[PDB]
Subunit: 74 residues, 6 copies
Amino acid sequence: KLRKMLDDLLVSVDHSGNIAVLRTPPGGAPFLASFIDRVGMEEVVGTIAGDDTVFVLARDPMTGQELGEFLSQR
Amino acid sequence: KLRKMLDDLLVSVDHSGNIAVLRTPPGGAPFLASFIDRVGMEEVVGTIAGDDTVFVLARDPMTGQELGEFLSQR
Amino acid sequence: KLRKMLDDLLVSVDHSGNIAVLRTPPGGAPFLASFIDRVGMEEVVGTIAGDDTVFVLARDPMTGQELGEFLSQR
Amino acid sequence: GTREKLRKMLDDLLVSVDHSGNIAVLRTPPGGAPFLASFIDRVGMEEVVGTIAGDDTVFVLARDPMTGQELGEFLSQRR
Amino acid sequence: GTREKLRKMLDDLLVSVDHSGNIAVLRTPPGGAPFLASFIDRVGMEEVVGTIAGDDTVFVLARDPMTGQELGEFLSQRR
Amino acid sequence: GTREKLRKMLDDLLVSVDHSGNIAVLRTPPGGAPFLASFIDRVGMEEVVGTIAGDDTVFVLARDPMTGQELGEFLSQRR
Ligand SMILES: N[C@@H](Cc1ccc(O)cc1)C(=O)O
Ligand SMILES: N[C@@H](Cc1ccc(O)cc1)C(=O)O
Ligand SMILES: N[C@@H](Cc1ccc(O)cc1)C(=O)O
Ligand SMILES: N[C@@H](Cc1ccc(O)cc1)C(=O)O
Ligand SMILES: N[C@@H](Cc1ccc(O)cc1)C(=O)O
Ligand SMILES: N[C@@H](Cc1ccc(O)cc1)C(=O)O
């Protein structure tokens, strides 16, 4: 469950333009991001995970702030 | 040849705003992206590869959709 | 010091839209990016590092060009 | 606390443990290896010389004379 | 099919093979190591305890009593 | 020049060196392991079979019969 992953891994959410930024604990980004990819959300154009940072690309016309609010809401 | 790399590695292309998103098979993103970097395309501001996802940043005024169409066309 | 890291690691800076792109020597991206993260700059929404490429997301209304100019200026 | 945290990390991320020679091999779910390995590093195991995470695999190097197997067992007992 | 795919992977990604002790070391082109290693994991080699990919290098741990060299040879013969 | 560059790399990135068996283990600051390891690869050490970088850790495999320790010492002497 993404909801469960998000309580353990989502340290914070931020945004700018079409991107939602998710912060995780150290090394957490690929574990969280690949789980997002498996959910298969239509508004999620794609994700890239660094070490502690995920960039999630929102499908126009959704903004990165809206997208990040939906992930933070879970 | 990028054309050849793209038939073996490009599972799909997507976009939003100034970003083209390329999906690859598992672990394929850095192999595909670094090969894009070596091509040296003026409209490609840069790329970042995750595991199975490449973000390619299009130079304004080109959009991520146009850029992704040119890569998908190869 | 970020200033010192930037002379050793910043090969070039580029931009498009809300993103500043930093190029590093091979494998340098996570070393440079995590150091940016530790600085904690309010306009930096987040960073993701690939191998030789950092994407830095600028907080609206700052552009990726302005942000990249401030990093290049250090 | 650190121990309760390690135990929960291991329970949620450690799919299996294996070994060969002085290496213990941890398997995780997809993307999980840096998350798990980062934390292991942070607990400060004297018997661990170091770790490297891939995507779903960690190699944990055992400090001589300990073996990869013994390392693995130590970790399994923390679950 | 899996074998034809492994063979093509190896032909296109394996620049060289080397070894030391219980480790086989695969070299790839730039960025190629996770692509190759992911696939190796997926073929299910019983003689492989696990793999870790860097950027252009994979370490493949051989299951005791097999050696890194023997592993390498097995892989070379699949090309 | 390559040597002055290696020396500066090592001085700035090598927090510590350790070993077990045929592996030398390099510790770096955060994110530093691919930067350091890339460069090591590029200097062409005959005694190095290969390297893999994580985030803050590199495993350097020593070419038989050299040991992880001896490798480490060689690198320490370049600082
Ligand atoms: N936040 C960036 C930079 C980073 C890289 C390595 C780290 O250990 C920490 C941060 C990323 O996750 O890609
Ligand atoms: N698509 C993201 C997340 C991801 C990370 C690890 C994976 O194994 C799979 C997907 C990326 O490539 O960075
Ligand atoms: N520039 C991209 C692609 C890349 C990946 C692996 C490399 O070795 C080089 C480049 C990134 O840094 O993610
Ligand atoms: N098991 C290897 C190879 C791998 C790479 C990428 C993957 O998505 C999956 C597996 C590692 O974790 O490095
Ligand atoms: N060979 C090592 C170090 C390396 C890191 C990044 C590179 O781009 C190249 C080499 C690895 O694959 O981890
Ligand atoms: N030391 C391990 C685990 C690790 C992963 C991510 C980190 O940010 C820190 C440590 C490695 O370098 O792979």
